[PDB]
Amino acid sequence: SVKSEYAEAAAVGQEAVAVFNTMKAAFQNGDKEAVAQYLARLASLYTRHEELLNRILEKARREGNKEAVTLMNEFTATFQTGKSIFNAMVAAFKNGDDDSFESYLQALEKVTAKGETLADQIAKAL
């Protein structure tokens, strides 16, 4: 169903949030090897989430669930804002620009919060 597909995508998103927190702690602790590994993990999780979201979006659209589609489109906008920030943060990491990296972390926390509430709203609209 839309609900079961939603729960699959939710578990991928929940992993992405948890991995981000572990990555951030590694950065603060100076473990750059770990930061690099977790950035690569996040890149793959974001790709997977995008793939899952698009399939759910089209099913909800065919089902005439206009509210869920509207909320999914809002979530995509926040998620893609975060993805673009993430890509710039990966560049800052490999360039050793730690002040840029810190600024991006702050921006990603704000985007993540917007996506967390939208994710809750999507579940209610199903």
Ligand X SMILES: COc1ccc(-n2nc(C(N)=O)c3c2C(=O)N(c2ccc(N4CCCCC4=O)cc2)CC3)cc1
The site for ligand X (CB under 6 A) is made up of: 6, 9-10, 13-14, 16-17, 49, 53, 56, 72, 75, 78-79, 82-83, 86, 108, 111-112, 115-116, 119, 122-123
Q: Is 34 or 123 the residue whose CB approaches ligand X more closely?
A: 123
**Cα–Cα distance, 110 to 106 (Å, whole number):** 7
Closest distance to ligand X from the beta carbon of 64 (Å): 17
Residue of 109, 89, 91, 84 whose CA lies nearest to 101: 89
Which tokens sit at 34?
């770990």
Phi, psi (5° rounding) for residue 29? -90, 5
Residue of 124, 125, 119, 121 whose CA lies nearest to 52: 119
Q: Is 9 or 39 the residue whose CB approaches ligand X more closely?
A: 9
Closest distance to ligand X from the beta carbon of 78 (Å): 5
Closest distance to ligand X from the beta carbon of 55 (Å): 9
Give the three-class secondary structure for 99: helix
Closest distance to ligand X from the beta carbon of 56 (Å): 4
